[model samples]
Target: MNIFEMLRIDEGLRLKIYKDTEGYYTIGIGHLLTKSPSLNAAKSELDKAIGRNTNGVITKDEAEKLFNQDVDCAVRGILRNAKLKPVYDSLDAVRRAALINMVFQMGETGVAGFTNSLRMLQQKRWDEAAVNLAKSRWYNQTPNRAKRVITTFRTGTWDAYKN
Candidate 1:
């Protein structure tokens, strides 16, 4: 599956901003809208996406449009990262999607922090990368999503793609 399709399941579309599980306000495909302090700045733009001066409201079309933009930004960010470029380019569509998926969730800079996992993925050592990825606090925080991502990385197949 493509990044958009994958994100549809993972992040889903929340047309209204609400406090996340940890209480950070988020809206439209998990856009946390920057962190807390700078959120006021983000909410101004979010108002436009919502088609009103009010925050916490987004229409379906706007939400999907924002999703597209964010996904593309994440994809391009992954491609532009010097360290991740070669590794990302060397993988298949499934693997590439999985790599970009992480970028969408963490931002390319955050994903770069998984040094050992990235190295193992670069070496095509799928099992090692899976193990390394599972060792992170990221995995501890979201085991279900982490398992899904790690499985895709390891198997090089779309977890939801079935006949």
Candidate 2:
């Protein structure tokens, strides 16, 4: 699903914020996102939120939604950015999925903070990258999520889509 259309409801409330995962935002219930809630109907702005949630992957089904137009732009811009550009080039489908998942949960910079993972991935060190990925705030923020992505990377497949 597109990240933009994905709902980032407040943990305790229904308040939604369209967070830009690839752009630069966090998973929090904040006013900036809540004020407009729709990313002003901008495709780029909306996809930023979508990419964050879906890890840069949007299904055709998602495109049928009224909100896809907005988030699509956001995801495209993020894909073309310098910092995240390599993320697209260096990762395999599984790795790409992992990166998107990390970015979705931690934002670009938050996941980027893992110098070792980025470095290992850049150098094509899968084992090391996996190790580095496991050693992060992600491990503590949500143990289940961390395990899911890790499994996805190792087995080259995951079925966590049914949550």
Candidate 3:
């Protein structure tokens, strides 16, 4: 299933209502939804916010306005350009989508910001990557959430929550 569709499964009206707004065919983290040709557009926008790729947490209301105004235009304006995409060619849709979700929430820069973690991922070092993922201020601060995501990414299992 599409990861963005995963978001569609059980979101609240504050979010649903946000989606229902005019150009908001996508799901965004902040209040800013944009007009995409489809849900892909929305998720793309969300990818930027979760990672702090952009400035601040877009309030729900700002997102609604952004989408209704021009979602496609908005997404472009926000993401700049999708031209030099560097997503790995070998990953499955789920994993690619998951990574994108991670990058999206974290930003290309955010992922890069995790220097040691990115190095591990680039080197195909699973244990080191997982270890690096768990060593951040964000992770150390919220161990549960961090562990769960890293576990999901690492073992492809839901074992992180057990920590």
Candidate 4:
């Protein structure tokens, strides 16, 4: 329920540069690329964004601030998706958190591609939906995290990440 903890759960603690949804480079908890072409320039822009003068990489403290700023937009984007609204609204808190994490990992449009998973979820078939999630590229990429979420979806209880 705390703001920083929620942001950490949603964004993950990251201090290194990574790619964003648009394929441009990002760093510091979902901070995206800017208009400047050069990597150094982009870092400078990020520095300005976070009010820091360090290298392109960000500290966990700074990442927390950035995630706080960015999370609302992600939440709004999820809420705006008509196809997702009812199912999203119906889930218990943990399942809703999992769905939010899904949206965070892959945007609303990307989540829509998991048609069968969505259908299973809508029908309250948790195990089937969990299976469908396991078969996804997302699951293949991050099996441990996916497994935890899948187990949570199926049992409605928080599960530890396991391989």
Please provide, for model 2 over 43-105, each residue's C-alpha lDDT reduced to its tens digit, 9 standing for 90 to 100. Answer: 344356555444333443443342333234334543856666575577666556566655644
Query: lDDT score, residue 6, model 2?
Result: 28
- Regions more than 4 Å wrong, model 3: 5-13, 16-87, 157-163
Question: lDDT for each of the candidates?
Answer: 0.80, 0.50, 0.47, 0.71
What TM-score quantifies how close candidate 1 is to the native fold? 0.89
Q: Write the per-residue lDDT of candidate 1 for residues 1-163, one digit (tens) a residue.
A: 5777887778877887765544566788877665575567668757865567865577888888788888888889988888778889888888898888788887889897887788899899999899999999878887888888899999998854433
lDDT for 29 (candidate 2)? 25
lDDT of 4 at 31: 63
lDDT of 1: 0.80
Provide the lDDT at 76 for model 4: 69
lDDT for model 3, please: 0.47
lDDT accuracy of residue 20 in candidate 2:
42
Best-matching candidate per lDDT: 1
TM values, all candidates: 0.89, 0.52, 0.46, 0.75
Model 4's number of clashes is: 0
Better of 1 and 4 by lDDT: 1
Number of the top TM-score candidate: 1
lDDT of 3 by residue, 1-163 (tens): 4444322222222443245323454343323445555555565666554444433235566554443443233223324423213323334444444454444333455554666664555466667778888878757754654565666567654343322
Candidate 4 C-alpha lDDT tens digits along 68-151: 676665566668987777778888876776777677667789886788888899899998898888998888876766776677
lDDT of 4 at 113: 77
